[PDB]
Design a protein around this nucleic acid. Sequence first.
DNA 1: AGCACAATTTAACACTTTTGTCAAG
DNA 2: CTTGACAAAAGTGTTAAATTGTGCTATACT
Lengths: 49, 49, 169, 48, 92, 169, 96, 345
Amino acid sequence: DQFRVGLARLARGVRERMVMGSPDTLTPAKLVNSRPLEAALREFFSRSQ
Amino acid sequence: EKARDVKDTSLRVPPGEGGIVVGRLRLRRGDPGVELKPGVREVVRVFVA
Amino acid sequence: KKEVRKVRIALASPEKIRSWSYGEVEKPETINYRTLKPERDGLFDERIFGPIKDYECACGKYKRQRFEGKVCERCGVEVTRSIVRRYRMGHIELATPAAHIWFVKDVPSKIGTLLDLSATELEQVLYFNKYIVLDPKGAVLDGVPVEKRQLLTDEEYRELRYGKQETYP
Amino acid sequence: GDPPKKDKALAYLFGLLADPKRYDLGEAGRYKAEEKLGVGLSGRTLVR
Amino acid sequence: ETFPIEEGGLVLDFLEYRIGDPPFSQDECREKDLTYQAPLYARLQLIHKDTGLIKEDEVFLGHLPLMTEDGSFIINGADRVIVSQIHRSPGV
Amino acid sequence: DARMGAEAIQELLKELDLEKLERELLEEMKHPSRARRAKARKRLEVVRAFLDSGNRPEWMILEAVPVLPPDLRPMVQVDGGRFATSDLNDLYRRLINRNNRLKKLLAQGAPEIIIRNEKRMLQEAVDAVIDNGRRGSPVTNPGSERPLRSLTDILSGKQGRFRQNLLGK
Amino acid sequence: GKAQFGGQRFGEMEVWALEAYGAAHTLQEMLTIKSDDIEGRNAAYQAIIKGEDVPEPSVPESFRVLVKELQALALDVQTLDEKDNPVDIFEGLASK
Amino acid sequence: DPVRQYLHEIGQVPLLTLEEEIDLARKVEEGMEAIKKLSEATGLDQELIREVVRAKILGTARIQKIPGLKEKPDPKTVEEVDGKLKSLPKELKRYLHIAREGEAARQHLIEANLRLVVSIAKKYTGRGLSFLDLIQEGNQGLIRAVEKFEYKRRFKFSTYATWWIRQAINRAIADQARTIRIPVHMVETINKLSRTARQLQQELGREPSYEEIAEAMGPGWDAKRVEETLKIAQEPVSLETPIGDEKDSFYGDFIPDENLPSPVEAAAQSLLSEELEKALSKLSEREAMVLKLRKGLIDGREHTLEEVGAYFGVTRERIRQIENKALRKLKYHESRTRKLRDFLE
DNA sequence: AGCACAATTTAACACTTTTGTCAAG
DNA sequence: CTTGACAAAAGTGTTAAATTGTGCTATACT
Ligand SMILES: [Zn+2]
């Protein structure tokens, strides 16, 4: 449940890092992010009920 | 006795937990497989049984 | 010096509040990222809110009880105990005059029944979503001349002050 | 808030119902509710 | 569910996710004040709706905590537990 | 004169005649209908409160900002190397930020639109530093969760200073 | 808690319990000397260490906080004395 | 509602196409040059009469009445400038209207591009500003890009504005977000470093190390320079942050008060202040009253040997030996009474 | 997100003064 | 209780190195 929402939170961060920079060929490596997902999971794995 | 630069800091033992030392665990900044807080030096977690 | 048997509470005025303050804190900088000392205008400022160290002023031009109460002329810090930092207040000179939400959203709605208005309508006003009338100056409105203690809208106000006009592309 | 555009209600409201990715009606919900009311709902959606 | 991530546009899709190998055993974590977590790699492909650029690359997600044998996890050296949540089943 | 927001309210609240309204309401009290009569009662209660306390209602619209002393909500470091700050601090911060930027826009000659935008953000920030969340969704620490505890938020509640500290400690 | 090394709570129920019996000074110490009051708690240790009786408190210091706290809302905190007259809550402090 | 507010306020006024746009910019520049033209009329600075236009334009009494307790008041430093150029022939009095209409047109074009500025700040969220803030400062960036724009260059103002909006926003970031003031360049380098880290994390399939992350940063980048400033970067911590898992505990309530000396210290200190007074009386009327002046016991400020010797009439040498002997002479009384032998910390 | 540059602050450093001290008076 | 002599600690001043605060960037982009 937290993997999905915490992934979507990165889905938007993906769609945003697209509309700019160098649209020609950007490896998905520069497109994807870590923190928006990672911290989102750790959130549930620590501060949840 | 002069007032020396450095003053005592060192961590004593709680009022009511009298134990015996068992685990001697030291973690120095600059050792393999240990990443400490950003700008902190060696730590220690001692066990008292 | 006198037995305290009584304590009142009442409203305060901009003047009285100006008096309570020792200066106007401006800059958002709480404290420096380096010296961690009260900034020039910092919220935690030691210049007008009194010393963090008893009798020791900021720079240290006066470091002891010897010179008591004498205002520092260099760094601008009155020599005294660090206790004053827990009492001596401060203030902020608000650019445009602003109200207090309490009297507004309160159950009896102080300002509202005061001036004889309603929570909703007065709300639109105070929060700058809706104009209100003060001395209409003979201004007509839809056959009924607008009068004081009345409410207007973004359009009509212009249509009165700047006049009405239509556009035809 | 947003203007009553004819394309905004084509996207939003859609995303709230026929969209299995924004509406996950649990396999149970798509299952349990399926056998009471007498119907065949396919996806985890509401509409199609 | 969260894929493909779309936007002349971008069709970035999902392919796989590499199951990480625990960096530090459940012991090391308990004595390092570290969470028992493993890097979860992810493999995907970035394509364009026009350019037809099929450019593929294995990216990376983060570190996912792992469960012990008994059913409790390790969080910053302190082992924690994930209990169960109750509510009326979805439906009508 | 359509003036909107706190400014206008300040002017009209200033113009008020306590006495005249008093007599008017007194006569309004003799109205046979329970409506006008009740209204006159419940309204005049306020005016009366002002007439007696001798406090002027315009004070409700405040130009200054009574800023609590620094040491009453400090920022102090603890063991481990990181600092710690009160909620009211960041609140006061947002307050002065909007307050200053507003001035920046004023002398600048900026158009009416931007003016109303910031001039209103002033009322919302200021009132947020007094009671945070009694009007509109409360403001929380940037990007996280817990709503900043304002002045009125420290007083009320079961943990209010009147209880957790002064009626028991 | 025993962690931070501190005393128990005297919260309102306890206060009332004291008011019941009628122990005044016992309640005083609670609200001031034995708890918070600045010069009071010190004058206590002073007295007891010197083998005498502790003076009666004045400023609870929590209340002193409340004063300026209210003042932040533009609430004039007017403290009167025995007949409708000024009183300086904060000793010689904010007197400007 | 403040959110919908601005959106519905700007959505009231339309945009501007090439026609209106080019025209407006031309109007503004014409008003500007008109001011420079009238700047030689009475000899008034181009900026002076410029703001003097504001007096009757974007407010009558509200522009100069309260920029603090003091500014340029309507009757004094304004009125003599309003009714000064007020008597000049046609060839002058016309530039007045040129400046009026130019000045208005400025604000106009701004309002026109506002529907852009807001749509700009949309990407820059998460900076510790929920929309409206970001938008405000962006509006300032617009005001800048406005007076600096040049229509003559045949460039769409939407291009020139954006580069300035992004500026006034990315600037407002460092001057707002972190509770502790963090200078611009600091944050700049922060974002640089964090970018490199958040980048090579996926590259190496794990987190970096202060040595390898600073490696790709440049020269002089060791484990220290990154880990050091890393501390600075970290913002303070809300005292309302709940401790433990139960709904009671507060963060702030968990902090001690060492600011004021504890009662035990009140008596500990007041004890020494006395015990040193009684063990002092065994000194000669000179070597005692002098033994206080060197410790800052007398006037609270310390009195150097040079001055003490001037106070007793003796020499910078005599007082020196006086202190020595007087002191150890007390050391005998201490080592024989054990009254003060504590306080050794 | 990144940059050149002016504005101050801080740091390095050159050298005078003060204060503390040694030996003899 | 004291004199001349003199190391170390302390002081007054200039300059170098470092830190900090501002202004701009123009395809167009609402
Ligand atoms: Zn000073």
